[PDB]
Amino acid sequence: RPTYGVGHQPYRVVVLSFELLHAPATVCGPKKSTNLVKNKCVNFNFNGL
């Protein structure tokens, strides 16, 4: 029922479980990229390059 106390109100619980083994990380989260400011002596790193 939608008339519960906070202790028993329906809570959506998602257990995001991360896993490592002798395999490459087929799932990553590298969603942090700079922009492309060009033609200056700078530090570039093209995805590990």
């Epitope: 029922r1 008339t3 906070v6 028993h8």
Partner: antibody
């Protein structure tokens, strides 16, 4: 938390009762509550449990007869005994059930069916 | 069904003495047994649950142990707060089964 029960008295066989028990110090819609009767000269018998979600779980003998409920606004557990039997006489206690079990015991209401 | 038996039904011991009481189930319950203390005219107080966990508030002198079929409560030293009846309850989400009760009194 104090559980204060009322309605303890005499009732004819086959009659209807509504035992009450106010819970003080906690919100009834946030904890498990239970009805447990102790007959004179016997151990305890947990007869029913109402969850904080309104999910009523009755024992098979009391399934279809007794109605466990809670008034969150009044914060009071109620038990609607229906189709009473001779064996339904006992000191009936409202109680608070938890992960660990029954921690808060009501003072109890006597119930005599004869 | 599942029936638990308590021994001794008639025990007279003195304050300071141990009170060794035994409650045995006919078959294995694993760990779903609890020790309670009830006085006449009073409701039982849960002394120990899971047969090894000290219930919060009950004196540590009570040492409940056991599994499966057999269980034993040991009052290390009797005290006047321990002069009462003792029950063992098989734990179940439904009605379950309770012990017959070991009434402990002051020996004289």
């Amino acid at each position: 938390v104090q559980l204060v029960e009322s309605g303890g008295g005499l009732i004819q066989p086959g009659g209807s009762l509504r035992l009450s028990c106010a819970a003080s110090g906690i919100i009834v819609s946030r904890n498990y509550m239970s009805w447990v009767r102790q007959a004179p000269g016997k151990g305890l018998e947990w007869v029913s449990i109402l969850y904080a979600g309104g999910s009523s779980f009755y024992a098979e003998p009391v399934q279809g007869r007794f109605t466990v409920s809670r008034d969150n606004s009044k914060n009071t557990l109620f038990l609607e005994m229906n189709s009473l039997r001779v064996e339904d006489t006992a000191v009936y206690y409202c109680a608070r059930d938890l992960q660990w079990g029954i921690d808060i015991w009501g003072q109890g209401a006597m119930v005599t069916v004869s | 069904d599942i029936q638990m038996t308590q021994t001794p039904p008639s025990l007279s011991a003195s304050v300071g003495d141990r009170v060794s009481i035994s409650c045995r189930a006919s078959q294995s319950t694993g760990s779903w047994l609890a020790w309670y203390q009830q006085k006449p005219g009073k409701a039982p107080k849960l002394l120990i649950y899971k047969t090894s966990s000290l219930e919060s508030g009950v004196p540590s002198r009570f040492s409940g142990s056991g599994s499966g079929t057999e269980f034993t409560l040991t009052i290390s030293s009797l005290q006047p707060d321990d002069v009462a009846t003792y029950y063992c309850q098989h734990y179940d989400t439904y009605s379950s089964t309770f012990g017959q009760g070991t009434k402990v009194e002051i020996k004289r």
